[PDB]
């Protein structure tokens, strides 16, 4: 479990910082999207969001993230179907909030361990 956190952390940090550098004027969504814990890390609550933004992001990093989180998922656990905002500004806020909360979850879980 510490192993998956450490594998994911550079991927998450890079995705967030690259978005902060490339995207200008992204509004605050004020939404909670990712549920960090279940109490173990909550792959089934986090995974659908990454599946939903895969076409909008770096598919290669996303695929690595998904492969890591799949290892922390019960096969029986169902995944919510995610609604990605269609409006361009809402869609960037949606992506940005996912990256922020994923970063925060891993940092939180790491302090736990």
């Amino acid at each position, epitope marked *: 479990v510490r192993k998956i956190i450490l594998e994911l952390q550079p991927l998450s940090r890079g995705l*967030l*910082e690259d978005y902060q*550098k490339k995207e*200008t*004027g992204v509004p605050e969504s004020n939404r909670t999207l990712l549920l960090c814990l279940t109490p173990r890390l909550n792959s089934s609550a986090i995974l659908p969001y990454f599946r939903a933004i895969r076409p909008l992001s770096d598919k290669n990093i996303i695929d690595k993230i998904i492969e890591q989180l799949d290892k922390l998922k019960f096969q029986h656990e169902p995944e919510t179907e995610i609604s990605v905002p269609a409006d361009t500004f809402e869609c960037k806020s949606f992506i940005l909030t996912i990256l922020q909360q994923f*970063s925060a979850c891993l*940092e939180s879980v790491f302090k736990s361990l």
Partner: antibody
Amino acid sequence: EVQLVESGGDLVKPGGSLRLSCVASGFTFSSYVMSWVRQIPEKRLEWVATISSFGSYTYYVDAVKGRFTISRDNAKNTLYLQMNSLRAEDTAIYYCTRQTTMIAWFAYWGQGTLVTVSS
Amino acid sequence: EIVMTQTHKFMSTSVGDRVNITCKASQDVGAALAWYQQKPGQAPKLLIYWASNRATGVPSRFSGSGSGTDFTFTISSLEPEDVAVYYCQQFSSYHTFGGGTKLEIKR
């Protein structure tokens, strides 16, 4: 509630140095871009510097490049402005601010810390 | 570097009047403009972003319009607590602020 509290402003002579700190509470500090904005006595606002979540990217306004250094310590929820080779026109209230990406607007401001540079 | 020009340093208004504050950018910034209000002894407060989105809790008498290079900040009916300095700011590229427009009461 989101809170930013600046400290470290003081009087200094031209060519001196000073270190500003901003301690943040009420949000996950490492999730956000952080920035400094200053306001000179004539009340013009000037953006100063910006740092991404984990320090990989920084931008500086030309007036302070090669003299000021922005940095952050995520463990301590603290943003820093290291100010070297200070000049009189650096005299200003320095505000700590939070942003979503590196080029954006400033929705959260601290109360400011006054820096006075004078011979 | 994108220069933001607020032509009027000061404007006289009367309570109950419409106020139009103008800001022009030296190059196209699209809608990537923000408006701030500042009262003495306080930090600036965000009012409008993306030229016309009113930030949370901002009174409905405040509004912004424009896209491109010419922007207008509008108070539909000035209230006494609205006496302040208003600044525009572009975030199309590296941050720059207009020089401020102080509202004062005509008598």
